[model samples]
Target: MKKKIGLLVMAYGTPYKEEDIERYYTHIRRGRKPSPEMLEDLTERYRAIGGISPLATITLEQAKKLEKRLNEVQDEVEYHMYLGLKHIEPFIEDAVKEMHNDGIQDAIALVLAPHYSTFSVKSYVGRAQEEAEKLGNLTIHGIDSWYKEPKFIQYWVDAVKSIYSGMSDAEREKAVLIVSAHSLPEKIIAMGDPYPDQLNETADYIARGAEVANYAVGWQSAGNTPDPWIGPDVQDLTRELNEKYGYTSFVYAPVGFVAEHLEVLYDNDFECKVVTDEIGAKYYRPEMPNASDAFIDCLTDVVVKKKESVM
Candidate 1:
């Protein structure tokens, strides 16, 4: 006999269609109408990246995999997996509502990110916790961070080794590794958030295993706010390294993100790749850890531990 727990996987959702982009942007802006210029910018970016984001599709697939694995474990308890987004349809609040409607009384809220921060991780959990609290019958446990999970680190280390070994010797010669993640406002550090620190921690752990000497940590896909966002933007960093200092091949490992999204596809693949190409440097990103078995195992490990505490 087991209690059915709702395993809610949270992410920053994406539009499945081009027409959904405006609504998506508006939701991200918290119902504040996107400026005409801002909307247009997002439209063009989405259009350039095949007119839609792969996040929604990929996340659904991830949910399916995790569901099967969680159910297969020796069932003192069972898990029913769900996917909710911070910024689109199937929003966190709505997801919590659905879980309650389905008679789920216990849940764990996890952002897809490994490392945690007050601004990013807390914001997502705040939504889930708010809705869960209002329900008055369900309990929500938030996973603030899992960057140090042995399996999580193993996946990245294995992927990096495979990627580097597959490259030609000449390609390896000038390949300065650039570990990147979504950038936030610089004010977060002054507020004593651990986002930057954890990202560096993840990068260092992976780098130590991958054994590359010329690697640098950089930020990517920061918002276009007038307020300063964190810097050493990956694109600008690539240009300076290639054009100014004469690096050739670039290996991009998005340590902060696990799935393929607008950041990895458009920002890293297209935008950053073009910059490297312009400077005669080859650009490469290790395959994204989307729906891989290792990825599901990492979540299962986290979820099972939490489930044990309650069971």
Candidate 2:
């Protein structure tokens, strides 16, 4: 009989509808509700982006594709995929419980995100692990870092080349590639987080792969908290790169995310667009890998490697 492997894929959850935003926000804040004005601001952002985010739909499809890919690429194992949201229905804990009930003794847990931070990917894996412990009788092998997955890096390299090769000589000369990730608090560095390092490493690999001449690391979606967050923030860096460095155009490679969610749709396309327009420079981002075959192959390869290690 083929070995049974449970694949638990987790991701940040989003509101399913406009009305669910408040509840979703509260959950994300660990039960602290947003003020009326804060709620309105967030609602407006969502409203601006077609009233909802496609994260759930895209992530679900990713899980399905990953399952199929694993089955197709390997015969020694039977893979069962389970999806969980960090702060919504069918949560990480629930998925782990489901796997336990399904009699899955050996499993691999990974977040949709590539890099791992204690505050992000770890939380998802820890929750699933905690639930597994509480329920007992399950082995949860978590994949902490997959940012360097060969296929994953190739996806970004191809994306960068696609945009770079199409630019005119002048545009290419004046263009600087900004490889970015979601900014975490600056304190994370003191806490020994490897987030920034992973981001820079991934950025370096992609730049070299695509033969990018000028590129720099950037950060986006910093929180509104009291303490400082990571940088050089993408928008600020873009402005500086244009003004000081004389780079008139930019290629945005957000290696931070694999799917297009509010951050990419609103933050990059909407907010960053406004910034680039004011500066009279071009800002371009490749489409996210949402449910793409390349990304599925990457996910499949990650799981397959982890399965080999454990089995």
Candidate 3:
């Protein structure tokens, strides 16, 4: 009989439809339901992006590709894929239970985000362990951060180069490469979390590899809470570059995210594009590394090496 290994692929979840939005936001708020005003505003954003973000679908697609790749390359153990969402249905605990029911004795938790933070990746791993604790036989080995993975860097480098190369020489010359990630609260700065630093490093690697000279780092999609989130907001940065520095073209890359969802679709494609359009500047975002072959390889490398080291 083959040894069973469960790959717990985790992601930040999104609502599947408009009706689910309030419940989803409530989950994100930890049982504190959003006010009617807040809920409507969020719903409007979703409505702008065609009534839903493809995050939930894309996440499952990524998991499916990763599962197929793992099975192709590793034959010693049978690999099972389970998607665990942070904010919605099929939550982390739910996936762990599925793994337990499937009789998977050894499991690996892999968050879709590349960079790790105490509140992000670690939180997912922490949850997996807390749940797996109930099923004493299950051992969860987590692949914490794969931001520095060579293939991971290559994926972004390839994406940046694709868009950069397609631009006219003059546009490339005046273009300001703005790389961004999701924003956490200001308190993360004091915590000395590696999230910010890791994002910078990934941006540097991508910018250097793509030979993009002029660039800035920014943050996006901060929560609706009162606590100040990290800034030099990406949209504001784009406006400033166009108005102040006279950059006519902006090339944006997401070093923090690996998939296209609300942040990429509404935040960048819609909101940021509005800013650039108003400023008479062009906005260019490379296609996200969603279930791409290279990205799957990166996932494979991380999981394979993690299994090798831990098991």
Candidate 4:
């Protein structure tokens, strides 16, 4: 009998309803509920960004597209796909359980996160592995990172260029590019993780591809922690560009993301936009590559390569 192949679309889940915010935020805080003020703040974040994140729905769209793309004109193997979230229902473990129930024997777990670190991508991998461990016969392949992939970079360049479409030559010249990603605790470096370096690597290629000379990378949406996370917050980065560099406009390339979710919509779009207004700079970015065929194409290539590495 042929081995069963399945694709697990891993994501950081979000609440689909306003009332679900408490449990969702509590789970993201690792089983600890937020303080009353924090809960109110968190609730407001959701409210400000359409009452719920589109992550799960978007990941499902990616899954559907990827499954169809991978199976088109199939030759030797058939594939099935499922969505798994790390911090919400249809949790990673539960997704794996369903896979097992379907008798999945060969599987590939691809996180929606392109950047890898001890905590970010590995957390999803670990969750999936925990459930897989219970099934002795199952063999699962997981992608560590896809930031350097050609398709990943190409679509990112396209997304960046789309942001510059209406700008005249002088506007383009005066516009500085700000590349931002979600910030994580600095302690991730203590484990000698490659996330920060890889983010730079991704940014460098994107800047070159987008043909932008004046560009800098910054981290955003860091947790409200005292110990510190990553350097040069997005707001500060925009301030420097406006006040020091004298750039009147800024083009944001959230290459850190392949889709729009709470972080992109609320953190970068809403919160950071206000920061730009205060600093006398305009924050503009094209729509993200949410479940776009190009993105799913890149993801498909990553999964196919992983499958080949095993078989």
Give TM-scores for every candidate, taking all chains together and pairing residue i with residue i.
0.93, 0.97, 0.95, 0.94
Question: Candidate 1 has which clashing residue pairs, if any?
Answer: none
lDDT of 1 at 220: 93
Q: On lDDT, who's better, 2 or 4?
A: 2
Per-residue lDDT over 59-113 for candidate 4, one digit per residue giving the tens place of the 0 to 100 score: 7788789988988735667888878887788888888888889988878888888
Residue 32 miss distance in model 1 (angstroms): 2.7
TM-score of 3: 0.95
Top candidate on TM-score is 2
Tens digits of lDDT, candidate 3, 196-259: 8888888888888888888889999887678999898998888777777899998888778888
* Better-scoring candidate (lDDT), 2 or 3: 2
Model 1 over residues 14-116: C-alpha lDDT tens digits? 8887778788888778788888898888888776777575566888887778888888875776887777887787878888888999999888877788878
Model 2, 188-291: lDDT tens digits are: 89989999999989989999999999999999999889999999988888888888788888888788888888888888888878878999898898989999
Clash totals for all models, in order? Answer: 0, 0, 0, 0
Candidate 1 Cα errors over 4 Å, as ranges: 35-37, 243-245, 309-311
Instruction: Give me the overall lDDT of model 2.
Output: 0.87
Choose the strongest candidate by lDDT: 2
- Model 4, which residues run further than 4 Å from truth? 1-3, 53-56
